[PDB]
């Protein structure tokens, strides 16, 4: 029947084992899900050579996904938008023609622990039951500093598609956006200001 | 009625004016098209800190688009594939679910001038009449060497879509793949071998 994910029990690509062992409790706490037979889930990681708060300042901007995500034509939150759990955004995504619309809900926002997450709750695309969580972590070794971002999701496998294609699609989207996040924040860190 | 494109008469993003003035004859020769009212066309550029042949070795691999393009699940050319004008490839693209299929024809392959191009001639997506050309150019200044890649396309604007969304879609795809090309070839150049 239902199962618990195992992301917190194996090393995700692009993470070292030493890094994983430092993150294993966070992965258990924030990146575990109970999933049903029609669902899949994945955990992706991205190392970033920038301080945590530099990365978090970008990651946390629910109303400006275009700043670290590809193919965002627009994102609207409506005036009086205040960043609070339950707020929603309408994203127009130009990954194809016509452009897709995704309505997304802010699920988590913890500025102290550097955790956020959202759920897709409308739109005209095929990803159903999509929910993701992103956490940001600082590392240090001999005075050197870096960040690891972890992003996991759960989603329904769409009718007529395999889990492997579903995971390949969502994994590729998340991985490429994490690479943009790394570039944007490493540029920020390099240039200071 | 029909018009000639003007890419060879203005500076595309990410190119310096000095670079453009060196490339203007190539842009006129390889990146100009006669287009009809229902069509749009764009020219994109990418500077790469690697020698021309390092970039060209990758650009020229019609059967391995996955090496510098995002979201390629597979590409099949069939046994006895020989790289000749008229050869075709079946690309499966995982930019959405279900994955798209594009059947593409090799239009140009000039290893001396570093020119290639392809036309989409089948599949189950919406891009109709898509044709692109890619050229690769070497620059030198005071012993320093770099490459510029130019990629242009012509495509039909799909029913119910604006030219601006059509250009935004194709421009973003091409720009992001040119960035992967730059990363892949700059890594190659940095590591030599
Ligand atoms: C890029 C794209 C293409 C689709 O077909 C679905 C949807 C529009 C939701 C999406 O924005 C997917 C976004 C995902 C998976 C994650 C994110 O944004 O963190
Ligand atoms: C990424 C993608 C999404 C689509 O919806 C159309 C198609 C499948 C053709 C495509 O491969 C487009 C590829 C383009 C424009 C250029 C290329 O490859 O040089």
Author numbering:
A (entry chain D000), B (entry chain D000): 28 to 220
Which sentences from the paper describe this structure?
The binding of the plant phytohormone Abscisic acid (ABA) to the family of ABA receptors (PYR/PYL/RCAR) triggers plant responses to abiotic stress. In the resting state, the PYR/PYL receptors are monomers or dimers and display a wide empty ABA binding cavity flanked by two highly conserved loops, named as gate loop and latch loop. To investigate this issue, we have selected as a model SlPYL1 which is a tomato dimeric receptor with known structure that is involved in the induction of stress responsive genes and drought tolerance. Interestingly, the analysis of the structure of SlPYL1 shows that Glu 151 is not involved in the dimerization interface or interacting with ABA; rather, it is located in the latch loop.
To investigate the relevance of this amino acid on the receptor function, we generated a mutated version of SlPYL1 harboring a Glu 151 to Asp substitution (SlPYL1 E151D) at the latch and studied its biochemical properties and compared them with those of the native protein. The overall structures of the apo and ABA bound forms of SlPYL1 E151D are nearly identical to that of WT protein with the differences confined to the area of the mutated residue. In addition, the ABA bound structure shows that Asp 151 carboxylate is hydrogen bonded to the NH of Thr 128 at the C-terminal end of the gate loop. In addition, the analysis of the ABA bound structures of SlPYL1 E151D and SlPYL1 showed that Glu 151 replacement to Asp leads to the formation of an additional hydrogen bond linking Asp 151 at the latch and Thr 110 at the gate. This would explain our data showing that the ABA bound form of SlPYL1 E151D displays increased stability as compared with that of SlPYL1. However, the degree of such stabilization is higher in the mutant protein.
